[PDB]
Amino acid sequence: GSITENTSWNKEFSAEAVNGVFVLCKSSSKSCATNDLARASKEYLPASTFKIPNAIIGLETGVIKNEHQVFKWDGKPRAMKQWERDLTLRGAIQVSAVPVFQQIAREVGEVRMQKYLKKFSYGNQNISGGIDKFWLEGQLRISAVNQVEFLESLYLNKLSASKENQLIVKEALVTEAAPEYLVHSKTGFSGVGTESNPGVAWWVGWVEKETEVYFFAFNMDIDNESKLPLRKSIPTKIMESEGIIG
Amino acid sequence: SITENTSWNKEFSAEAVNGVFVLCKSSSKSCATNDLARASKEYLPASTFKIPNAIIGLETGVIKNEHQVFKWDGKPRAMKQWERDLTLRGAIQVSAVPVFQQIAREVGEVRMQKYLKKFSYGNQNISGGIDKFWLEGQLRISAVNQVEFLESLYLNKLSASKENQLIVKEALVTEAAPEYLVHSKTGFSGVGTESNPGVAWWVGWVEKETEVYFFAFNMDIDNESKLPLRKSIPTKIMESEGIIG
Ligand SMILES: *C(=O)[C@H]([C@@H](C)O)[C@H]1CC(SCCNC=N)=C(C(=O)O)N1
Ligand SMILES: *C(=O)[C@H]([C@@H](C)O)[C@H]1CC(SCCNC=N)=C(C(=O)O)N1
Ligand code: NA
């Protein structure tokens, strides 16, 4: 397990006047590279990336029955029209249907939710702030490095959850599929934050390319929703210039 | 039950293709096709056999697990794309025959026969050599049967652990989009011989919103230049029904 600083990559950040970090790890050499060692260890609210552990915990606790469970839309207004539908597990993840996962956390409960974030070594493991908000506005925080450790565990089925439930969540996280490579990933965006205290935007996941696997985690400060696409454009550019997905 | 849709014939005739498309919304209990007779006609599975072969490899422990790497011994293989180490998904996606031939040999005739019976896989005939019965032997399966088989897989209802079915299902993802996932497998038996065409396949399913469509396409083929039609005809149909694209 090694990490090195690669201040080169900074060009793709500077080009777009973005402050953030990319962490990219090659599984076979167990070696990671980042543009910013300090920021890679800095902990931010997970925002919708929390839907990964939350989904796993919901399956393990039985709250989510199985891979085919449909979360039925009860008709009442949701903060996004995208969310105003019936949704599969993948559907609710792809669209980041927060209220689906707020109810899941509610049924998981504080005690099991804390037990699992400790077993998963997930961030600071602080779920203070309300059972259906701690990852959105409460005290939970996780690093880019911790994300890639967590994702590597999931990939290897080594989290303290059934392998079946880890496989279920992995397939729901597939976002791009090609003959030579598969991408599993999850976006996050906490909001634009306050004056002097921007929000955070995330892109985490891993790339299966030939016999190699690359785990990655991107975060950036964000005070303008206009800039959201940059959470994929900068890591994708980085990953292309490494020959991984381009 | 299977019901004929005449409308779908346009895409075949335009291309001078003799083939069938089978499409089933939600379940295999009602399927639509351009050709009732051909929907249930049984053909060599060719590379589509990699799906049951992968499941059986896992169930028997021949494939140790999802992360197994099939190492290349460096000796010539029939396609340059196969001359590399491969994961399970990789070996499926490039249709690395010799990887699956060794799998078949290690599974062996007795176990292969048992699982094909459990899976209701076509005519369940594995004669013709343990490492080639799905390539040039007597094995045959229809488009309708592929749909039934894939539906069982999708539902984790094959006689196989849920874990192993999940592994193979992930290995079969070929298109991911926000609204839908496609799990699929292509096949091409070759160009056949005079008056006896080969067969080309595309089978799979589409998870879209909360709906699932099972599909199975085959055509006669005697010229490899026609091979792109195996995807474009069923894609065109599924795009015109509003399922993908
Ligand atoms: C998670 O990161 C959020 C969740 C908290 O809403 C979802 C929503 C979005 S983008 C729209 C949010 N607008 C806020 N004013 C994403 C995303 O990853 O793009 N995830
Ligand atoms: C399985 O259907 C075959 C396997 C038995 O060889 C592979 C090969 C091809 S096409 C490559 C060009 N063929 C030249 N002989 C496919 C395919 O799905 O297209 N699968
Ligand atoms: Na693909």
Author numbering:
A (entry chain B): 20 to 265
B (entry chain A): 21 to 265
Task: Quote from the publication.
Carbapenemases are the main cause of carbapenem resistance in Gram‐negative bacteria. How β‐lactamases with weak carbapenemase activity, such as the OXA‐10‐type class D β‐lactamases, contribute to anti‐bacterial drug resistance is unclear. OXA‐655 is a T26M and V117L OXA‐10 variant, recently identified from hospital wastewater. Here, we have solved crystal structures of OXA‐10 in complex with imipenem (IPM) and ETP, and OXA‐655 in complex with MEM in order to unravel the structure–function relationship and the impact of residue 117 in enzyme catalysis.
In summary, the crystal structures highlight the importance of residue 117 in OXA‐10 variants for carbapenemase activity. This study also illustrates the impact of a single amino acid substitution on the substrate profile of OXA‐10 and the evolutionary potential of new OXA‐10 variants.
